[PDB]
């Protein structure tokens, strides 16, 4: 039962990331088109297709992909939330440059 | 989510923003279409007819 459903989740996690790296690509485009060309690797996460591939005598764990320090909300969501920031402050200069 | 509600509708306002902009420049030079090709083109007639 828990195969089955790890094979599911996998395969929507899988389209989950491709969603987000599709919006992240969107986003660079839209400020490279202001002039800010933000690096597209620099928000993009990377997770290996082939994971479920593995044997399951052998763990898969969050830490493996995010280790401490590092996680989405540790970092990722801090590092996105800054850039969110970063636009507000940029949104403030071109009210201003209007 | 973030992104889409908060951070792309952000780069969505900076971009419409700075369309504002670009009009904004559009219309100075409008201006200055008018202003020195024109009103101080049609200065410079009229003070040279004075």
Partial sequence: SRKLEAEGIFKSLLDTLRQYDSSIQNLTRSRSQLGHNVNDSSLKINISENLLDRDFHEGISYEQLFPKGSGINESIKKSILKLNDEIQERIKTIEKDN | ?50
Wanted: charged share 25%.
């Fill in chain 2, 1 to 50: 989510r973030i992104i889409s509600s908060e951070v792309q509708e952000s780069n969505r306002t900076e971009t419409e923003l700075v369309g504002l902009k670009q009009n904004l420049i559009n219309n100075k030079l409008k201006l200055m279409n008018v202003l020195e090709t024109g009103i101080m083109y049609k200065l410079e007639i009229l003070q040279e007819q004075l």
